[PDB]
Design a protein around this ligand. Structure first.
Ligand SMILES: [Cu+2]
Ligand SMILES: [Cu+2]
Lengths: 620, 620
C-alpha cells in the first residue's frame, strides 16, 4: 500500500474514534482542520505509520488544540493547546459563517440601519468574511467575522447585484455577540438584477453552437493504480487531496528510459490571497485567504461530465472530515484526463525530403472550488516534452459595492450605481523540489545585453548570466520581465551527457505582485505576495507561506519567518515558493457573471534530458 | 462580390497579361512580390476596383520597378523604377536561392576551404541566407546572399547536425559571382547525426498513446461565404492571404444585438525578425526578416488532416504568383475550425441555490510556414467572450554552429562539439484598429500603488492611471510588467450604456525586445523591434514596420520614418504595431528537433459591451 494514497472514509472515522476516546472531542469540540501527514524524510523506511493532523476548536471559548493521531496504531501522538492571540486563530468553521446573519437580524443597530434603507431584514443576506487584524485591541484572542449586506429580492435572485454599502458589522462568533455596527451613510442599493439565467437578461438563447465531441474509443492512455497513482507517457505521480490546499501532486517523476527520475517532490497551491484595494472603512479590511482561512478543498464542487470535464474522464472522489469527525466525500471532485495539445514538433526539410509532424498532448488533473461569490479552477498539466504547468481559472460573480457619485479611483462601475472594488487574486505555489533527487540549488538567470565594441564589432551579441542563491537571506527574488528573468532549479551532482547539471526552468507570467503599502497589515500577513519567488531549506513544519493559523494572525508568520533562519540552500533539500496573480479592475463584461480569466506559471526541462524526450512518439 | 475575397488564379493571370501588354513583363523580368491591395478608405466605394501591387525584378541587371495595376480596368495605375541602393532590394527570389550552392561548388577558394576540412563538395549543402547591410561597399546596389555550409552524409540525412564553422561565402545572385570566401579556421564538424526518424535514435516508438477522437456530428458552427467570409458566434470577418504576410484578417466585427460592430479593420503579422547573437564573423551578419526578405506566405505548407489540423477542418487554398506571373495554388494552406476551450463561466450560489456552468470555444484560423531549418505556425483565435488572440508557434530544427572548445557566452551546446547560437524570434503585429468605427485613440494604462496615510489609513488602496497618446511622437511605448502596463484602444465618440467610451485592452506577454546594441545595423533595420508598442495615423502607404523593401536595406524607412510625421492619433483612424518575441537560449531538449515554443498577445473587450456578451450561450 502506498503511503501517498488518499485518506479513507474509515480513516477519518478512525481519527474521530481515537479523538473522542482520548476525550479530545467532547460536545463543545469542533474539528477546524483535518488532514493526513505524508511520510517524513526516509528512503528504506517502511514503517507504515499513517498519521493525521487535526486542529480542534472549542465552541465554549476554551483554548483550541493541535493534535496528531496515528490511525495505524490508534494513538494520540501529540496534543497541544494553542494561544491563538499569539499564534493565530484556527480556520473558520462553516457553522460560524452561518450564525452571522442570524445574530445581526436581531441586533438593534443593524435593524436600525436596514430600516433607514427600507430593506426587509429577511431579504438581507450577509457575506460573513474573515476579519484579519486591525486596530481593535478587543479582538485579540477572539474569533471575529465581518459581515457585508446584499439584498436578495427572491429565493433565486442574485444578491450580489444589490450591495448595501455604507454598512459593515463585526461579530464575535463564540460568545455570539455583535461587537460593532458601522454605518457611514446610506448609498442607494443597485436596483438592476444580475440573474444571468433570466431570459429577460439573456435574451433568446443561441441555437448556433454545433457539438464538438471528444471521445477516446480505446479509453485513456494514463493508468490509475492504488486509487490515486498516475502513470502517463513517462510521467509518474500521486494525486493527493487536502481540505486546506485542495489537490496536491506528489512524487512527480519522469521515466527516462530505464530510470524513473524525480523532478518535484510535492506541488501545491499553499495559499491564495484576494486583497481589496477600496480604502472605504466598509471594505478596507477585506482580504480573503481562501486557502489559509476558508480552506479551498472543503468547498470543492462536484464536477459534472460533459459540463465541467469534457471527454474521457477519470474521477477521484476525495473524502474530508466534517466539523464533528465524520468523513464526507466530494463526489467527482477531481478530474483526470488527457487532451490534445496541437503540434508538438514539425519540420519539412528541403535537403532530406523528410516532412515530419507530431501532435502534443497534456495530462490534466483539476478541481473547482466556490468561495462565496467566486469560483476557482485549479489545473495542473503534464506535457509530453516534460513541461509541468499550473493554471488557475477565476470565474463567479464579482464582489460588489455601490458606485460612488462622482466616480472613484478604487472602484469601477459595472451597472447603474453598481460598483466593483479593485482587488487582486494572488496564488502561491509551493514546490518541494526533487530534481533527480533532493540535492538542489537555484539560479536566477537574466538576459545580458552587450555593448558594441572589441569582440562585438557589429553590436549583435547578447548573452545570459546565472546567479546562484546560496542562503535564504538572498532567496527572496523579484521579477524582471525586461531582462527575461527566469529561475533554474538544478542538481549540482547530477549531470547530463554534456557534463552539465540537469535542471528545470521556471517561467513566470510576471504579473504585478501585492500592491498594498508595505506597512499595511495585509503586506505583513501576506508578505509572500510581495515578491515573485522564494527559496527555503526544507523543513517538515514549514508547510504554508502564511503560516499554520492564518485567521487573525498579526503578521510576519510564514515565509518571512522561515527565511529569517538564513539556512544554506546551495545544493540542499529545497522548496520553491512562487507568487503569481491577477490584478482585477472589474469591467462591464465581467457582470452579471464573470467570464473566465487565468494566471499561472510552468517549468520546462533545461538540460535535464540528453536530447529531446519525445523522439519516440509515433506518427499517429 | 466582396472586395475582400482572395485573389484568384484568373486575376493573377490577368495581372500577368496586363503587365505583358504594358511591356513591363518581358523574358528577363521576374515577379519578386505580387498581392492584391485593400479597398481604399471611405464608404465612397464607386464599384469594384481590384488593384494589385507588383515588385518586378530584372535578371539582366536593369533597375527593378514597383507597379500597381487595376486588374478590373486592365490598366497600369503606376510603375516606377527603383534605385535599390537607396530604397532597398526586392525580396529574394526562390530561384536565387538555388544559385548559391551551385556557384560555390565551382569556386576554387571554396573548394580549397572544403578540402582543408576533408569534406566532399558533393555532400556540402549551403544555406543561402539574406545579406543585410554591413561594411561591404561593393554590395551596395547588388543582390547578395551569404552562404553557410552543412554536411549531409546521405540523401535522407539532416545536414543541420553537421555545421561547417569557420567558413562563409558571399555571392552576387544576378552577375553570378562569388564575391567573397571567408575562412577563419577549421573546426571539427559535429559527427552525430540528427535523424529524428532513425529507429536507432528514437528507440522503439511508444505504443502507449491511445486515440483522442475530435469530431463534429452536425458539422462546424461557422459559415464560409464568398470563399473567405467567416461568420461564427457573433463574429464576422474575411480571411485574406498575402504572399509576404501570410494569413491576414479583415473587417473583424462582432454582432451586438442588431448592430454589427467593427473591432479591427486589418490584422496581420507585418514583419518577423530572427536576429542572431553570436559575435563570430561567420554568423554576426545573420538576421532573418522572414516576412520582409523571404516572404512567409510563399513558403506556407500544405496542412494534412489528422496530422496538422485535427477535428472538423474547413480549408482555404490561397493562390500566389510564381516568379513569372503564373498563378500557383497552396493546397490546404489555411485551416479553419472551432475548438472547445474549457470553462467559459461557472458559479454555484449558496443563496440562490443556482449552479451555473458554461463551456467556452474558439474559432481558429492558421497556417504553418518553413523558412529553411525553422517552421512557424501562425494562429489567430476568436473567443465567445469577445477576446481576440494571436499565437506564434516556433518549431523545426535549430540553426547550428560548432561549440567552441572551452565554452561560449553566445552559443550553447546541444551535443558533443555541436553548438547553437543564441537568437530571437521577434514579430510585429500590425493592428489597423476600428473600435466601433475609425475614430479611435490609445491610452497606456498603468497600475498605481498608493501610500498609506490620509484617505488610505490602512494602506490597502491601489488605483490605475490612463495616459492618452495624442501625437505619434509620444506613441512609441515600452512594456512595464511590474506596473501591469497594458494599452487600451477606445472610440471616444462611442460610449457604452454607462457613458464610458467603448474599448479593447491589449495584453502583451512582456517578453524582452531586441537585444542588439542600439548602434548596430540590425537595431536600425529592425528598429520596430526595439519597442513594444507603436501607434501611427493610418496611411495607405504605411504597411510594414520595416518598409516595402527590407532586403539589404539600411535604416531610413519604416516606423521611425512614419512616426516623425507626428500626426494626430487622438480620435483618428489609427494603427497599432505590437512587437513581441521569444529569446531562444537553445537547450539540449531542442535537439535534434525543437518541440513547439510559443509567444503572442491578446485583446479583451474593455467596456465595449454593456454586460457580458455571453449570457445567451446555452447549457443544452
Ligand atoms: Cu477578481
Ligand atoms: Cu529559436
Amino acid at each position: 500500500a502506498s503511503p501517498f494514497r488518499l485518506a479513507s472514509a474509515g480513516e477519518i472515522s478512525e481519527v474521530q474514534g481515537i479523538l473522542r476516546t482520548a476525550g479530545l472531542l467532547g460536545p463543545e469540540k469542533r474539528i477546524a482542520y483535518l488532514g493526513v501527514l505524508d511520510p517524513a524524510r526516509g528512503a528504506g523506511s517502511e514503517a507504515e505509520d499513517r498519521r493525521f493532523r487535526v486542529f480542534i476548536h472549542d465552541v465554549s471559548g476554551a483554548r483550541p488544540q493541535e493534535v496528531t493521531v496515528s490511525v495505524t496504531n490508534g494513538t494520540v501522538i501529540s496534543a497541544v493547546e494553542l494561544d491563538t492571540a499569539a499564534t493565530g486563530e484556527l480556520p473558520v468553521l462553516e457553522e460560524e459563517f452561518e450564525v452571522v446573519e442570524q445574530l445581526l437580524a436581531t441586533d438593534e443597530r443593524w435593524l436600525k440601519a436596514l430600516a433607514a434603507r427600507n430593506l426587509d431584514v429577511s431579504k438581507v443576506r450577509v457575506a460573513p468574511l474573515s476579519a484579519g487584524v486591525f486596530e481593535y485591541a478587543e479582538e485579540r484572542g477572539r474569533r471575529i467575522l465581518r459581515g457585508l449586506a446584499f439584498v436578495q429580492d427572491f429565493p433565486e435572485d442574485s444578491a450580489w447585484a444589490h450591495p448595501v454599502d455604507g454598512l459593515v458589522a463585526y461579530v464575535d462568533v463564540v460568545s455570539k455577540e455583535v461587537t460593532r455596527v458601522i454605518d457611514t451613510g446610506v448609498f442607494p442599493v443597485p436596483a438592476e438584477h444580475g440573474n444571468y439565467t433570466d431570459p429577460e437578461l439573456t435574451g433568446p438563447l443561441r441555437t448556433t453552437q454545433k457539438p464538438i465531441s471528444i471521445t477516446q474509443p480505446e479509453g485513456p492512455s494514463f493508468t490509475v493504480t492504488g486509487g490515486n497513482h498516475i502513470e502517463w507517457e513517462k510521467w509518474s505521480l500521486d494525486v493527493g487531496f487536502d481540505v486546506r490546499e485542495g489537490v496536491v501532486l506528489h512524487n512527480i517523476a519522469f521515466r527516462d528510459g530505464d530510470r524513473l527520475r524525480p523532478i518535484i517532490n510535492r506541488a501545491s497551491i499553499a495559499e491564495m490571497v484576494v486583497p481589496y484595494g477600496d480604502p472605504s472603512p466598509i471594505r478596507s479590511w477585506q482580504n480573503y485567504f481562501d486557502t489559509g482561512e476558508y480552506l479551498v478543498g472543503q468547498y470543492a464542487n462536484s464536477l459534472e461530465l460533459g459540463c465541467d470535464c469534457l471527454g474521457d474522464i477519470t474521477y477521484l472522489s476525495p473524502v474530508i472530515s466534517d466539523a464533528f469527525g465524520n468523513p464526507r466525500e466530494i463526489r467527482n471532485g477531481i478530474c483526470m484526463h488527457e487532451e490534445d495539445w496541437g503540434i508538438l514538433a514539425k519540420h519539412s526539410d528541403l535537403w532530406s525530403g523528410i516532412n515530419y509532424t507530431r501532435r502534443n498532448r497534456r495530462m490534466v488533473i483539476s478541481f473547482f472550488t466556490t468561495i462565496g461569490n467566486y469560483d476557482y479552477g485549479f489545473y495542473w498539466y503534464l506535457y509530453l516534452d516534460g513541461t509541468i504547468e499550473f493554471e488557475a481559472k477565476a470565474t463567479g460573480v464579482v464582489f460588489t459595492s455601490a458606485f460612488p457619485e462622482g466616480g472613484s479611483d478604487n472602484i469601477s462601475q459595472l451597472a447603474p450605481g453598481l460598483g466593483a472594488p479593485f482587488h487582486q487574486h494572488i496564488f502561491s505555489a509551493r514546490l518541494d523540489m526533487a530534481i533527480d533527487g533532493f540535492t538542489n540549488r537555484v539560479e536566477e538567470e537574466d538576459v545580458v545585453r552587450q555593448t558594441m565594441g572589441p569582440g562585438n564589432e557589429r553590436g549583435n551579441a547578447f548573452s545570459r548570466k546565472r546567479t546562484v542563491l546560496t542562503r535564504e537571506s538572498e532567496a527572496v527574488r523579484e521579477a524582471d520581465a525586461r531582462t527575461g528573468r527566469t529561475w533554474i532549479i538544478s542538481n549540482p551532482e547530477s549531470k547530463n551527457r554534456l557534463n552539465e547539471p540537469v535542471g528545470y526552468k521556471l517561467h513566470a507570467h510576471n504579473q504585478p505582485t501585492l500592491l498594498a503599502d508595505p506597512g499595511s497589515s495585509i503586506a505583513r500577513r501576506a508578505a509572500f505576495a510581495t515578491k515573485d519567488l522564494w527559496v527555503t531549506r526544507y523543513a517538515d513544519d514549514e508547510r504554508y507561506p502564511t503560516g499554520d493559523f492564518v485567521n487573525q494572525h498579526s503578521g510576519g508568520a510564514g515565509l518571512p519567518s522561515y527565511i529569517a533562519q538564513d539556512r544554506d540552500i546551495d545544493g540542499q533539500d529545497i522548496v520553491v515558493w512562487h507568487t503569481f496573480g491577477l490584478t482585477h479592475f472589474p469591467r462591464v463584461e465581467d457582470w452579471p457573471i464573470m467570464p473566465v480569466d487565468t494566471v499561472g506559471f510552468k517549468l520546462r526541462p533545461e538540460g535535464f534530458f540528453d536530447r529531446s524526450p519525445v523522439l519516440d512518439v509515433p506518427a499517429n
